Amino acid sequence: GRPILEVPESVTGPWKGDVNLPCTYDPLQGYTQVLVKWLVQRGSDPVTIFLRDSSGDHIQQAKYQGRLHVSHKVPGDVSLQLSTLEMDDRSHYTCEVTWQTPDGNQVVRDKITELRVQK
């Protein structure tokens, strides 16, 4: 009855290749997606690397500009697409989605995945 994010616990991608960090949900009648964020935690707290809002897509660090995109064509698929994987891309990533609900309130869900980089 309420949106459920589907995010694998871990993903392995090839060093200097590409990989997707899946994040999907089945769209529910009467829910409106209003925000998507991807975060990474290389240090002590998660930091935002990507935001999609009413003005579109915003990449928050230069090292991702040209390497990071987020799925958009299929409703409910907000997977993160990373190209030229670096060893330093190994980390825990968080997918966070915000919806407006039929009653007018907003609800937020998130889920964490680990990216492993394989030589």
UniProtKB/Swiss-Prot annotation:
This is V-set and immunoglobulin domain-containing protein 4. It comes from the Eukaryota. Phagocytic receptor, strong negative regulator of T-cell proliferation and IL2 production. Potent inhibitor of the alternative complement pathway convertases. It is found in: Membrane. Abundantly expressed in several fetal tissues. In adult tissues, highest expression in lung and placenta. Expressed in resting macrophages. The chain holds residues 19 to 137 of 399 of the full protein. Disulfide bonds join 23-95. Residues 3-113 form the Ig-like domain. It comes from Homo sapiens.
